[PDB]
């Protein structure tokens, strides 16, 4: 049963691994909502529009490179149904700024929960993976995202739609 | 409630593109299952998941158009789960490659329920917009199919893991 | 006798180093046996031969680096002799790339230990060292030789010399 | 009060993080003050001039990178008085090198013990932050003073003019 | 106890060139604090922290071609404690500015002062380096932050958000 | 038990052909020692280090030339421990090109003696690939070294450390 390559791979990193693609793959359709919620022609910010679908096709290569680690190291990918977004209206540039923040913070959570897991188990490539290409990355996401949102309500978002006009084509363009 | 930019789209229209977007991205889910089965260690066969990659990001793409056509027309998209593919265990090349070929032909059965009830609405940019992007892309994506399934059939496949060895490198790769 | 360098550098971790130095220079030992085994006229697999022979100059360049990390550290390289391979005959491609991937499992298995010595004396230095230079290349190194010693076996190695040739050709060619 | 971006960041590390800051910028100035001496009239060693100016300019990258570290995790940075350096004279190459070398040691000191209370907090963003920023660096910088200091011992420094020359020459320049 | 280069150099201007360095890194270290100010998720204005940026790193050189002015004469460069900066938090964008443009005449004030100095000592030299290098570079810079005050003002500055986010994308970006 | 390829190859000669292999083996092993003798801190001659990293690789491929030589006769390569070096300390420049000088000459006699074998045996392929590819190579090195041993001797080594970091400089950077 075991794979000829598995080696210092605890059965609970795998299962917690498979956790996180599917977090992932929920936070790309996350974004992917949000991207077309702003294609709509009553909201219609263009570059809101582009940040997200960006941000979705991110969170999918993040999801394929934890099935890769899963295949690399071993384990067995096992996929989970991937939930729908929480809204299908997102209100604002600012509110989905808001919610994309929320989110980011809760994968990194997650991530900060798996690398605990990881040391537990005594398993340094799993921690340095984490470390090298979600940790950092997540800082600078939420980093970027709450920089976002202190600019939207700095400029009067969302009551003023002028504020995310030129928030979109200032910052986003 | 009406959308500013609507004209001659019907709810009906709006309901069966959403369940169309849905169908779309549980096609590309599945597609991604099926790549990573032949990047595990025990399976290794880098073409095949590579072509299903690529079947997964096209199947993204899709969706993505029916994403954008949808608010293009005023209809307002709805997403819902993505169901888990019904596989975790493809089994063999040969297996994913039938799997697929019925795959694409119920996504084409829809597209072609979808055309039905457009042309009975008299939505002419639909029919067209469905013609134009899907239907074509379907035929062609079901005729490789069944090249790739009658070759490996013919070659020896599943039995023969030469068969599905030779058939990546030299079809698939 | 204290190196003026040295610092939050364990002899224990030093006498660790000087092991590993050693295994991975008896890991390049045995992959150029491997491949000049592979070089024999009754054996005759090119690519087999220039694969293992890749492989011993890189054991070697891992052995040079860790040399470089001892002195770095202001520890004290003490060489040891370089045991002989336990065969001189291979005996098929497979065998050969069964053997690598043990070897391959062995020094990783290695390395963790070096890394959980790093661990419990402090030394996030080495144990940054071993995770970005040695434990991912280790990981890659294992899924490969799983990789071929499945496509191996699926095509039918080592009774099939049909699939040791065609294995050279196409995936090590 | 709490940073909206701030996620598993402890206040005693960012307190350690300000204090990081301060010694990075404290040894920026200290090289400051070495080039200039070498500037001298007296002294006028070009290269030794050069190559602490270098130094100064690096530590105070060092100092921004850490400013900007502390802002990516929602910290506060809170910057006190740059002290002077221990020295106005700093006698001659070699002991230049010397103090040099004892500053380095003294700031992977400081590190060390930023990454043991980065890993008591299980902050490890942070401890791959300095991992990989940091520490190597530190490594590499301690080891090349080493050879400075061995080198100039050597060759007759400081009572070696000619040795002090030759190495400004040969070495530095 | 002379240098033998030195020749027309008053100790009082030696002494006053002294006071002018400290003063330049000095006022390198407040726009310091104010760039990465600028650079606060809670701030969020890159331009701005740009600028700063840019301001800091060209007073270091300032300070630089003071102590190349003193060795270059045969003075004694003596350096002294940095001082840290007036405040840590900069209240905002058209605050920092006049903060900046007082920093920016306080120096002016003391590079004349210097001038009048070099003039009772008849030091040519060393009032026509001021001239050169110094003076009218403040001069510049007084005039470009009382635009920057002046426009942030005249946008409404600091209590539209909205004008400090414009002033940055559009004067500074 | 006949190799299909062996013609004019006596079991002698196979014999004394792997023991040139081990022998070139080992003195890349010397080789290596010496270099890391030379990366140390407190050694900290780059050039020698480099020279000797140098020589060590020319030995192992003059090694696989050697087993290529093995195979291509149609004999059988049989490998053996590679011994440590003598030393772990080469005490400098001096003494190691010294070492090397030595090394090289041992090892020049154990081709002439090869090349004795080999003519006894009447096997003139060999007798031409032992003159063109190693007796030359051997004389060369051998001249080299003595030209260096010559030059440190009279420049002062090894007790002049300005000797060695001035020949270190200009003959090997
Ligand atoms: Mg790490
Ligand atoms: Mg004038
Ligand atoms: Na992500
Ligand atoms: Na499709
Ligand atoms: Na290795
Ligand atoms: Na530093
Ligand atoms: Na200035
Ligand atoms: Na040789």
Redesign the interface.
Known sequence: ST???R??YHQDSEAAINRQINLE?YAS?VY??MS??F????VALKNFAKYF?HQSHEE?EHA?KL??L?????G??????????DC?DWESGLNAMECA?HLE?NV??SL?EL??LA?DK?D??L??????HY??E???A??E???????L????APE?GL?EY??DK?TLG
Chains 1, 2, 3, 4, 5, 6 share one sequence.
Do not use: W
């Open positions: 794979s000829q390559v080696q210092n793959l359709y992917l909502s077309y919620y294609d709509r022609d009553d679908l999918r394929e099935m890769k899963q295949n690399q190291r071993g067995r990918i096992f996929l989970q149904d991937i939930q729908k977004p299908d923040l913070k990194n959570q900060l690398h605990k040391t005594n340094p490539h921690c340095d993976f984490i470390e090298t940790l950092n997540q800082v600078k939420i980093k995202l709450g920089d976002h949102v202190t600019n309500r700095k400029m009067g003023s504020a030129l928030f200032h």
